[PDB]
Amino acid sequence: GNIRVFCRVRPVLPGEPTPPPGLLLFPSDPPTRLSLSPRHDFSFDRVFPPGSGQDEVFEEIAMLVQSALDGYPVCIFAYGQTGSGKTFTMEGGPGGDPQLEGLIPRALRHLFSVAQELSGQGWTYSFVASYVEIYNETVRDLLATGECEIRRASEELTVTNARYVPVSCEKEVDALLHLARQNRAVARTRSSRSHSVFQLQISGEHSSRGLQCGAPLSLVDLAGSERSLSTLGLVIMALSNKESHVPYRNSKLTYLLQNSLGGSAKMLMFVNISPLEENVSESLNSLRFASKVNQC
Ligand SMILES: Nc1ncnc2c1ncn2[C@@H]1O[C@H](COP(=O)(O)OP(=O)(O)O)[C@@H](O)[C@H]1O
Ligand SMILES: [Mg+2]
């Protein structure tokens, strides 16, 4: 239903073999079709060409993101093979170039400023960030300073032995991402085979009216798919077909996110695609996966 699927093809980078210019076309409100090489033809909510900037990728979903201030759970995924651009889309560049910042700092910046607009209407908002890594039935805290288990509250789920950090500006958010990169660097003494799960608990409360609101925003940099992950697909289809049973428990990822998947949760699916000829085989896999989600 309220599932949006977006496709993103990254630019060809230095050193990489130059692909045939007809390997990927982008025919012609935003562009929506991707053509591989009768010729495989796909269609999505938006197809971002290689020249797409980070700011444009976020602007397409800014309004869906702020519904998480209105009690809607929002769950965003980056899916695709290793080297296709999942981490660039989610985190962005590691060097602090503001044009290369990804969805996590742009989402949080956008939330901070809608929240300040709404404070003149009597609202106060609180934001609590966590960041955890799921590698083969193990959970590590990417925000450790300085064993983790997915546990219950009621019925909420948290991660034990993980930091839950109140954030209120862009610098505190950036510092958490840089800490995540430090902890990954130390762990070398892996992340291509791991889900990275960024969560922000949003609490709102009105001053003179007896109103409160609350919702999780999740930004998920999935493990690479090549050649855990299959369980996510199974969980998404079970909900599409209104199955009496949904097997959240079959993976630590769906078990953690089970309350941000069904129900009224808005779900955003970015499929990252490698432009290269050598990767045409895994690109087809990722595009079929995305085509399947978009019909669910
Ligand atoms: N949209 C993009 N524009 C420019 N460079 C990109 C883009 N997406 C990915 N890259 C580059 O491609 C390489 C692989 O990206 P990465 O996000 O690490 O892949 P993944 O997380 O999917 O394994 C990185 O060097 C990154 O800088
Ligand atoms: Mg990555």
Residue numbers in the entry: 309 to 336, 343 to 351, 368 to 476, 484 to 490, 494 to 529, 534 to 571, 595 to 663
From the paper:
Kinesin motor proteins hydrolyze ATP to produce force and do work in cells. Despite their diverse functions, the kinesin proteins contain a common motor domain with highly conserved or invariant sequence motifs that mediate basic motor properties, such as microtubule binding and ATP hydrolysis. For example, kinesin-14 motors move on microtubules towards the minus end instead of the plus end. Here we report a new crystal structure of human kinesin-14 KIFC1, together with new crystal structures of Drosophila Ncd, a KIFC1 orthologue, and human KIFC3, a divergent KIFC1 paralogue, and an analysis of the structural features of the proposed KIFC1 AZ82 inhibitor-binding site.
The new KIFC1 (2.25 Å) and KIFC3 (1.85 Å) structures were determined by the Structural Genomics Consortium. Both proteins were crystallized bound to Mg-ADP and are reported here for the first time. Despite its importance as a potential drug target, this is the first KIFC1 structure to be determined and the only one available to date. Comparison of KIFC1 to Ncd shows that the two motors are structurally very similar to one another with differences in loops, which are longer in KIFC1 than Ncd H1 or H2, as predicted above. In order to evaluate the ability of the KIFC1 L5/α2/α3 pocket to bind small molecules, we superposed our KIFC1-ADP crystal structure with kinesin-5-ADP-ispinesib. Viewed from the nucleotide-binding side of the motor, the ribbon diagram of the superposed structures shows the KIFC1 helix α3 tilted inward towards helix α2, reducing the size of the pocket in KIFC1. A critical residue of KIFC1 relevant to formation of the L5/α2/α3 pocket is R521 of helix α3, which is positioned under loop L5 (Center, hot pink). Interaction of the side chain of R521 with other residues stabilizes L5 and maintains the closed conformation of the potential binding pocket, disfavoring binding by small molecule at the site. The KIFC1 conformation with the highest predicted AZ82 free energy change shows movement of residues, including Y409, L599 and F656, to form the binding site. The movement of F656 allows the hydrophobic AZ82 F3 group to become buried deep in the KIFC1 α4/α6 pocket, which is likely to stabilize AZ82 binding.
